[PDB]
Amino acid sequence: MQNPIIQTMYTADPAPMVYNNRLYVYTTHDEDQSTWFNMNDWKVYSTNDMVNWTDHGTILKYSDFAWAKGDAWAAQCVEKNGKFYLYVPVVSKVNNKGAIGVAVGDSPLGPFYDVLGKPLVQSEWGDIDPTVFIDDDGQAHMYWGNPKLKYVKLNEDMISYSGDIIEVPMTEESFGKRDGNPERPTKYEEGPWLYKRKDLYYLFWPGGPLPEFIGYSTSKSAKGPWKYGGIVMPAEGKSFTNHPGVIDFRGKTYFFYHNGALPGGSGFTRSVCVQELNFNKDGTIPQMKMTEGITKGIAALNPYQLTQAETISWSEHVKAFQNDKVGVFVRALQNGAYTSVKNVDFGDIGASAFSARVGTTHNGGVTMEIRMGSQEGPIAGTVKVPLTGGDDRWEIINVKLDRKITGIQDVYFVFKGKASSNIMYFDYWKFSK
Amino acid sequence: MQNPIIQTMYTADPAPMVYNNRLYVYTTHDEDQSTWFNMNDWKVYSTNDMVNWTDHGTILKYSDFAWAKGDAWAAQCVEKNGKFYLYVPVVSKVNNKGAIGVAVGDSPLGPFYDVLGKPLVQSEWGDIDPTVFIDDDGQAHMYWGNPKLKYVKLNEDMISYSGDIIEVPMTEESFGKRDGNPERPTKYEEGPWLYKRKDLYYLFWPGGPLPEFIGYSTSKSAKGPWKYGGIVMPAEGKSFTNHPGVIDFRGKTYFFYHNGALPGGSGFTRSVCVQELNFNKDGTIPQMKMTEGITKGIAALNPYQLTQAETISWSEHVKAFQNDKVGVFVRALQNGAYTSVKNVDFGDIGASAFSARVGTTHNGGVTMEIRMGSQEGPIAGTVKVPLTGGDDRWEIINVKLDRKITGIQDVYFVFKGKASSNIMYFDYWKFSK
Amino acid sequence: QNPIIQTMYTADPAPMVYNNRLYVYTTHDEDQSTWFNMNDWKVYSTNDMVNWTDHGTILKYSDFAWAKGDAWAAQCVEKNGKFYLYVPVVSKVNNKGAIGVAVGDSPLGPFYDVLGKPLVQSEWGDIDPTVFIDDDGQAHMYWGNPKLKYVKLNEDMISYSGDIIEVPMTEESFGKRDGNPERPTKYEEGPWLYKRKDLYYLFWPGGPLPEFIGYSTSKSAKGPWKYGGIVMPAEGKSFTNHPGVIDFRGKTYFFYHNGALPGGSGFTRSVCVQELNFNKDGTIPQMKMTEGITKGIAALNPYQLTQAETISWSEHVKAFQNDKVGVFVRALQNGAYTSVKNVDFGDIGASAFSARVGTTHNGGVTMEIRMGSQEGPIAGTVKVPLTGGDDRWEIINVKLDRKITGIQDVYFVFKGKASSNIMYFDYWKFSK
Amino acid sequence: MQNPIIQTMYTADPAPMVYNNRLYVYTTHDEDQSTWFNMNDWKVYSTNDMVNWTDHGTILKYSDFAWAKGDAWAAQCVEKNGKFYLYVPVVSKVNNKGAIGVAVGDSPLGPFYDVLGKPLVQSEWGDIDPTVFIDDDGQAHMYWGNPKLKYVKLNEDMISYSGDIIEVPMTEESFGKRDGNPERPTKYEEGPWLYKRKDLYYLFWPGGPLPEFIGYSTSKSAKGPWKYGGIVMPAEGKSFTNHPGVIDFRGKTYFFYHNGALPGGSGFTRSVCVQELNFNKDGTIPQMKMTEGITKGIAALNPYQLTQAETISWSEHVKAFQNDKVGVFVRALQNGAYTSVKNVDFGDIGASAFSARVGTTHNGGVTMEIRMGSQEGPIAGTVKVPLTGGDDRWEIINVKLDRKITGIQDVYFVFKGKASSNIMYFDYWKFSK
Ligand SMILES: [Ca+2]
Ligand SMILES: [Ca+2]
Ligand SMILES: [Ca+2]
Ligand SMILES: [Ca+2]
Ligand SMILES: [Ca+2]
Ligand SMILES: [Ca+2]
Ligand SMILES: [Ca+2]
Ligand SMILES: [Ca+2]
């Protein structure tokens, strides 16, 4: 399928960003086997085609802020003049309560560094979930907060504010009515996201009472006042939280969210999803359910280039890792695990050779099958994966294919071996004419 | 004590060494879930009492030799004038064949460094399993090899050798008879260990045709000639290999070996064991089978001093880890996991308080019970383990015991929680009067 | 001004344009070298041709597990937002030169060895690769000293299909030198492949030493080549010169190196750049070393975070980096300074200033913000606090003695009472 | 001049400790070119003979305490049952004031870990310069403080305390009279050191007003009360501080201190010194001035074992460094720099060959001369140092000596090259028969 878009790790709280005709999504990371929020670092993924997502690994950690105690929660990255500002909530060590920090990088992949050495903003309590938006006039605005929605106008430097922290009036006209809660007069729960289309500003937000849904408000200007719009997406699935990120890419609008749809998924082991966001003619948004996502890619993938093992459309029983020597790589966790890429254009001439960086800890009996169409589709080639000792050691295997491959294909790599776990590790692949 | 003596890791190829009235055993490390030999680094454990073993973690890695390809196999550390020489077999990258290197350190725990930058010795083939022995006259001897037993006279510097590589005559007189195996004329397989008692030198060795047993030879000189002695220990258990280390400690002789007796144990997931070695009055060794090991501690453990969580007699469902912040620590893998230490002397006054450095990733419901005698014995105290976020973050918990503890006790630490895995992590403990 | 980088010894410049920013990858001569001591590669970037951002080390010889050392002249090329860095290193396997290739997903890396072995290794002289992707999408690699070699690379950019071609070392193609049968032509090493209109150019260091820069032209990227002439004679304190040529925003630039920094030499070099002029027929007249770009092609915005290591001209400053703050600069002695050119404060102007700074000295350490030159009027003084070492930092906010308006050159002068290591400086910004 | 004992780095605040018949000194480290106290990490050096000192490198840093802001000041390590407790003063980040922490390790070289994650003790102000002493009955005592001398009884576990922080009565019968300062009523300034000899306890301490001298007090009990003894050593030389460490080794007592006697030395670039401490028959101490140290080694150095380049008696124009590959090594900063080792026993047969691990960044012209007696003494051999590229690359050079060397010698290694700086680097050496 196409949702969740990442299956190699538990991801949540998606925050998209476009730079130079590429779509990135920054995410939080739920540790495996969590029964509570175990969130320590932030990830970024990217796509050129909306069906294949490249895993770029960790780009920031809570410990990159020397004053942070933990809790790497929902963040957002925005770009301006080739610099990338990543706004993050963390619990501070100084007073043991939430705060918003900011790191800055010169690429979407970083490296990102704490430029303040202290919080950008810390209130009385409830300093989580920042969203930042740069308007057409160049003015930058930040909203955040749980339980209270707060607002500040950011300076041009993007790393300070002047003025006060504005507590947005929690009105039933602005955010709807919840009943039976005085800490929470409205449906607003947390996680604001500020977006613009035509002449209208949108504030998307998780709403309560739990399990969370996604609601929205509208306004004529970025600073409010806000107008309740309705429910964008009702509560659904195994994750009691949902968290929105909305963005335009190549003339369409996309709605990122998360759920608990992976094996072992839950409210503490979530997974990021995406589907198209459709507007009515007046600019309102119809209620939508969780769908299977993007069914058709908007561009082809070139198989005659180095393509990462961690550029994945759909997979099962594969996890992602990284190290300093090769970067991000994937490991097959059991026999018959697979990765797939969609909309691969082998062209008219066709591919006759194939190369891959691979390895295994097992002595014999490890293969990777290149198949077309599905995990049981026709076999184009089989790679014998050599013993390397561990994922710090790798070999490149070049094979001639049983038959030249042409045209548009979906390519499946199936990993086979005699062991019960850790069948092999896979870094990148390529085809040759 | 009980066997295996290490249950928090798969360990093999034990190599004991005495320094300053403490007994150390250096071991290889079988990675979890191995179906082939996956061995990357070397460990050292130590004891003061023969029943409680301290895990000192990794003290050397194959990659600490820049010319090594992998295969961190059976090693031995010897001491001379406060310097420690660890002889290791590794496969070389230069020629893709085995070689013997040597690292030197200034404590039993290192740090250890490759002092040559190249092999100490490399022959034509089968350069594995070194043993090194310093005679009463101060002369050092090295044996090694599979299939051919090889010998060199080491120089005083211990990191070079004099003369030629001697191939020891593989005669039935020296090592017994194996049935038509052109390549293996004798029972000798690999893994020599040179030991001295009274006026007699012993060479212990794994023998084939396999499953492996332990045989021995004797001589009047450390260079030989060697005369076949008999079977020290027949093949037994789930490991097709066995590997001996013999040494005197406080007037008794101990026989270290390995088997496959841990859960998930096998020939590639082995576990180190020890039992006493008894001699006949003429110096020969009566054959023995694998026993429970050490029944009685030769010294008490002081509970009023800092004692490591990784100082363990017997345990279940505990694994050991390390990092640079706290060193070695242990993790409980499921509810009802436990560690135990034997022969703890609380004295006549007794313990009234307890302290422990611990943490968990779970939110509530995590306790560690201190019990006496067994994992089901009387509860002396309970520790509430707080949420810290991950094993990079820790708290110290101080509790007053309801029951004062006196006299000699066996202390069990039982780890309890509501989650199905990774209950908590544990670094050290101590009692107060 | 030239050299364009003064905070380290840099050499073998290899420019590259990505998304309207101009990068230059360089090699790194260690301080106090009496021989080639070259271990890692750097990348700098500009928006304006007068201020250069130091992005730090982006690759090391040791990132190739098979390399013994000698991180020499490299080039990075981009294709569909992936970046391929072709590097010469000495291999441990046979103790001779080889070309490797690393790949990254931004100009700043991270870059990883994707082969685990050389991309190419011949019998001898495997140094100084240049790579060019033609209009038809096909990529060409040249390299070599003493023999110019060529292969055509596949699209994957990390392999080649045909044979290693030894380009004929003829006078019609590379000029004539007499003596040295092993060097029949002026060609010495360091080829650079560039295209302008209908003509391909191969620039190269020429001998005998001290090196000059010559060029050849061709109608195809694969040759055959025809000698053009001398682009730049030998001059100054570096017996090597190494060319990189590129178009940026409608002009052509010639990167090279010399030994013009204090302590400079043939083993402590410094990268330079000046505009490259062509004749109407596409030939190149001889040019000498100039003072470089006299005017910036864009303004610098002082109201955004600006790195201390974004520098036009400086004295007695060195660059460093760590994982906590990234790249930063240290003032090595009193009267060290950095400067940035063509800064647009606008009509209203700046009233406040912030810098991340620190020092190891107890009192007496200041950084002066001055306009126009290092002796120009003082807009503000920053008292730099004791932090203990460049692992610890403080942000200092000041109000300016007067508002700053219009286009300015900004000088940051570092002062203290000690003999060395006055302070360290990470970034700054102004506020309205 | 055998003082200072360490010339390859600026060292201060010596704290000796004996373990298994070897003498260690833990020191603070003054960064080069300091005009203020720039102190970040702790060092340990060791000797077998009182004339040659081995550099063991950094064994702990301020940053190994996650709560420390900086100022790695005067520390002391004590041993008990093969565990080593290192008490350090650092400034806490929580409140920006001084605190005492404690790290624990399992060898004198570490690794050492903060076992509390917080201060062992923090008072209102003055938390520097701890000394710890374990008495004959096994109870441990801690003194510290500036300006106020403070005391606590440590628990058996050595990482906690009993009762209250005791402010020792700052009396003139106990610590003499100053006059002029209300916060300094007595000569006591800081830096206490608790020592025992026969039935008398001694507390040594820096005294003021500055420049600091060393005075002492006596008692019959470790906890006091204290009786002023007199001045042990008046202020002298270029360091306005002095800091005492006193200890017995092989039947003599040694007084460690520091001064500013190296090139570039000062109050912020200090150097550790040692000389013998003499007592009168009644246990009082005659006043002494700075001497040039130990004139004769109490044991010979064996040149036929691996000997570190950083085992040095006297040197000029040499600095010490370290990395993970080789450990500690030395660099000659200019032509004619040298190291020296004293009392080296080549024996009756003698050395005929020499080996050394070395390298240089220069292309040709680099030699290392082995000389006897002095840096201009007879040349036994010359080693051509090869180009390696940097101190991350090394070669071993073996040479035949021009003449055999026999008997007791002082060995000088002189580093020569044509360059103006950084001639070469040197890791270890050894002779062969
Ligand atoms: Ca968000
Ligand atoms: Ca990869
Ligand atoms: Ca062995
Ligand atoms: Ca521990
Ligand atoms: Ca080049
Ligand atoms: Ca910076
Ligand atoms: Ca002291
Ligand atoms: Ca050394």
Is B243 flagged in the annotation as binding?
yes
Spacing of C-alpha A86 from chain mean position: 14
Q: What is the dihedral of CA D96, D101, D107, D112, to 10 degrees?
A: -40
Number of domains in chain B: 2
Distances (CA, A) of B54 to B45, B309, B411: 5, 9, 15
C-beta separation of B29 from B322 below 8 A:
no
What are C328's two structure tokens?
């930063």
Quote the CA–CA distance of B258 and B290 in Å, as a whole number.
10
C206, β-bridge pairs:
C187, C212
C14 Cα–ligand 5 center, Å: 6
What are D191's two structure tokens?
């830096």
Q: Are residues D246 and D387 in the same domain?
A: no
What is B109-161 written as a DSSP string? T---EESSSS-SB--SS-----EEEE-TTS-EEEEE-SSS-EEEEEPTTSSSE
Annotation marks residue D183 as catalytic: no
Which amino acid makes up residue D249?
A: F
What is C114-154 written as a DSSP string? SSSS-SB--SS-----EEEE-TTS-EEEEE-SSS-EEEEEP
C-beta separation of C271 from C257 below 8 A:
yes
Pair type for strands A252-259 and A245-249? antiparallel
Residue B47, CA atoms < 13 Å, CB-side half-sphere:
25
C-beta separation of C92 from C103 below 8 A:
no
What are B49's two structure tokens?
């009492």
Measured between CA atoms, how close is C93 to chain D, in angstroms?
16
Pair type for strands A22-30 and A10-19? antiparallel
Q: To which residue do tokens 């190369």 refer?
A: A355
Residue B60 lies in a domain: yes
Nearest bound ligand to the CA of residue B113: 8
Residue A400 lies in a domain: yes
Across A2-137, the runs of DSSP E, i.e. the strands, are 10-19, 22-30, 39-47, 53-61, 68-70, 76-80, 83-92, 98-105, 113-114, 131-134
C32 chain-D contacts, CB cut-off 8 A: 419-422
C199, β-bridge pairs:
C196
Q: Which of D74, D136, D80, D132 is nearest to D108 (CA)?
A: D80
Which amino acid makes up residue A240?
A: F
Give me the phi and psi of C211, to 5 degrees please.
Answer: -75, 145
Residue C2 lies in a domain: no
- Are B22 and D82 an interchain contact pair (Cβ–Cβ within 8 Å)? yes
Quote the CA–CA distance of A359 and A384 in Å, as a whole number.
9
Distances (CA, A) of B292 to B5, B27, B49, B51: 10, 20, 16, 11
- Are A305 and C156 an interchain contact pair (Cβ–Cβ within 8 Å)? yes
What are B297's two structure tokens?
């501690």
B159 Cα–ligand 5 center, Å: 44
- Kindly name the residue from D55, D129, D190, D369 that is annotated as catalytic: D190
C-beta separation of C217 from C282 below 8 A:
yes
What are C242's two structure tokens?
């190494």
Nearest bound ligand to the CA of residue B57: 4
- Are A108 and C112 an interchain contact pair (Cβ–Cβ within 8 Å)? no
The burial class, CB within 10 Å (0-12 / 13-18 / 19+), for A81 is exposed
Which is it for the CA torsion B3, B5, B10, B15, positive or negative?
negative
Q: Final residue of a domain: which of D276, D294, D328?
A: D276
Quote the CA–CA distance of D69 and A117 in Å, as a whole number.
13
- Are B106 and D109 an interchain contact pair (Cβ–Cβ within 8 Å)? yes
Residue A137 lies in a domain: yes
The residues near C221 (Cβ < 8 Å, ≥ 6 apart) are C132, C134, C140, C193, C195, C200
Provide the 8-state DSSP code for B64: G
**What residues of chain B have any CB closer than 8 angstroms to a CB in chain D?**
20, 22, 48, 54, 56, 66, 80-83, 104, 106-109, 111, 113-117, 155-160, 302, 304-306, 325-327, 355, 357, 394-396, 428, 430, 432-433
B329 Cα–ligand 3 center, Å: 27
C-beta separation of A402 from A380 below 8 A:
yes
Annotation marks residue C189 as catalytic: yes
Q: To which residue do tokens 């918003």 refer?
A: A100
Q: Are residues B30 and B135 in the same domain?
A: yes
Distances (CA, A) of D262 to B356, D28, D265, D269, D421: 46, 16, 5, 8, 19
Q: To which residue do tokens 């840096």 refer?
A: D375
- Are A33 and B421 an interchain contact pair (Cβ–Cβ within 8 Å)? yes
The burial class, CB within 10 Å (0-12 / 13-18 / 19+), for A138 is exposed
Measured between CA atoms, how close is C286 to chain A, in angstroms?
37
What are C243's two structure tokens?
């060319």
Q: What is the CATH number of the domain that holds C390?
A: 2.60.120.260
Q: Name the residues around ion ligand 2, CB cutoff 5 A.
A: A 308, 327-329, 427-428
A327 chain-C contacts, CB cut-off 8 A: 110, 112
Q: What is the CA radius of gyration of chain A?
A: 23
C428 Cα–ligand 6 center, Å: 9
Quote the CA–CA distance of B417 and D332 in Å, as a whole number.
59
Quote the CA–CA distance of B42 and B64 in Å, as a whole number.
11
What is A360-409 written as a DSSP string? BSSSS--EEEEEESSTTS-EEEEEEPPB-SSTT--EEEEEEEEEEE-SEE
Q: What is the CA radius of gyration of chain B?
A: 23
Chain D residue whose CA is closest to B46: D106
Best of D153, D157, D304 to mutate (most B CBs within 10 Å, chain B): D157
The beta-carbon neighbor of D104 closest among B159, B306, B396 is B306
Quote the CA–CA distance of C245 and C227 in Å, as a whole number.
17
B215, β-bridge pairs:
B205, B231
Distances (CA, A) of C368 to B71, C135, C331, D337: 59, 50, 13, 41
Q: Final residue of a domain: which of A276, A298, A319?
A: A276
Quote the CA–CA distance of C380 and C383 in Å, as a whole number.
10
Which amino acid makes up residue D228?
A: Y
3-class secondary structure, D157: coil
D428 chain-B contacts, CB cut-off 8 A: 115
Which is it for the CA torsion C224, C228, C229, C231, positive or negative?
negative
How many Cβ contacts (< 8 angstroms) between chains C and D? 56
Which amino acid makes up residue B227?
A: K
Q: Are residues D134 and D77 in the same domain?
A: yes
C-beta separation of D316 from D374 below 8 A:
no
Residue B146 lies in a domain: yes
Quote the CA–CA distance of C322 and C324 in Å, as a whole number.
6
A53, β-bridge pairs:
A312
D77 Cα–ligand 7 center, Å: 10
Provide the 8-state DSSP code for B21: T
Q: Are residues A56 and A146 in the same domain?
A: yes
Residue C289 lies in a domain: no
C245 Cα–ligand 4 center, Å: 58
The C-alpha angle B231, B235, B236, rounded to 5 degrees, equals 130
The residues near C226 (Cβ < 8 Å, ≥ 6 apart) are C172, C173, C216, C217, C218
Measured between CA atoms, how close is D298 to chain B, in angstroms?
16
Q: Which of B393, B49, B392 is nearest to B250 (CA)?
A: B49
Residue B327 lies in a domain: yes
Q: What is the CATH number of the domain that holds A247?
A: 2.115.10.20
Q: Which of C302, C291, C292 is nearest to C407 (CA)?
A: C302
Q: Are residues A258 and A342 in the same domain?
A: no
What are D297's two structure tokens?
């080694």
What is D55-77 written as a DSSP string? EEEEEEEGGGSTTEEE-----EE
Quote the CA–CA distance of B236 and A87 in Å, as a whole number.
61
Pair type for strands B200-207 and B213-219? antiparallel
**Containing H/E element for B174?**
helix B172-175
C-beta separation of B188 from B126 below 8 A:
no
- Gaps in chain D following residue numbers (C to N > 2.5 A): none
**What residues of chain B have any CB closer than 8 angstroms to a CB in chain A?**
31, 33-36, 38, 40, 63, 69-71, 361-363, 387, 389-390, 392-393, 418-422
Q: Which of C382, C393, C429, C374 is nearest to C320 (CA)?
A: C393
Quote the CA–CA distance of A400 and C65 in Å, as a whole number.
28
Q: Are residues A191 and A328 in the same domain?
A: no
Q: Are residues D226 and D323 in the same domain?
A: no
Characterize C130-161 residue by residue with b for buried, 16 or more Cβ atoms within 10 angstroms of its Cβ, and e for exposed: bbbbeeeeebbbbbbbbbbbbbebbbbbbbbe
What are B377's two structure tokens?
């014995």
Which is it for the CA torsion B105, B110, B116, B119, positive or negative?
positive
Which amino acid makes up residue C16?
A: M
Q: Are residues A318 and A265 in the same domain?
A: no
Chain C residue whose CA is closest to A397: C115
Distances (CA, A) of C3 to A58, C161, C208, C291, D227: 37, 40, 24, 8, 69
What domain range is B334 assigned to?
307-432
C-beta separation of C163 from C203 below 8 A:
no
The residues near B251 (Cβ < 8 Å, ≥ 6 apart) are none
Measured between CA atoms, how close is D174 to chain C, in angstroms?
35
B144, β-bridge pairs:
B150
- Are D36 and C361 an interchain contact pair (Cβ–Cβ within 8 Å)? yes
Quote the CA–CA distance of B361 and B391 in Å, as a whole number.
8
Q: Are residues D177 and D63 in the same domain?
A: yes
B358, β-bridge pairs:
B395, B426
Q: To which residue do tokens 């007189």 refer?
A: B173
D251: left (phi > 0), else alpha (psi -120 to 50), else beta?
left
Residue D288 lies in a domain: no
Q: Are residues B420 and B319 in the same domain?
A: yes
Quote the CA–CA distance of B293 and B286 in Å, as a whole number.
16
C44, β-bridge pairs:
C24, C54
Q: Partners for A (CB, 8 Å, 3+ pairs)?
A: B, C
C-beta separation of B251 from B298 below 8 A:
no
Q: Are residues A252 and A157 in the same domain?
A: yes
**Containing H/E element for D172?**
helix D172-175
What are C257's two structure tokens?
């190196």
Give me the phi and psi of C61, to 5 degrees please.
Answer: -55, -35
Give me the phi and psi of A252, to 5 degrees please.
Answer: -120, 155
Q: Are residues D227 and D357 in the same domain?
A: no
A254, β-bridge pairs:
A247, A276
D323 Cα–ligand 8 center, Å: 10
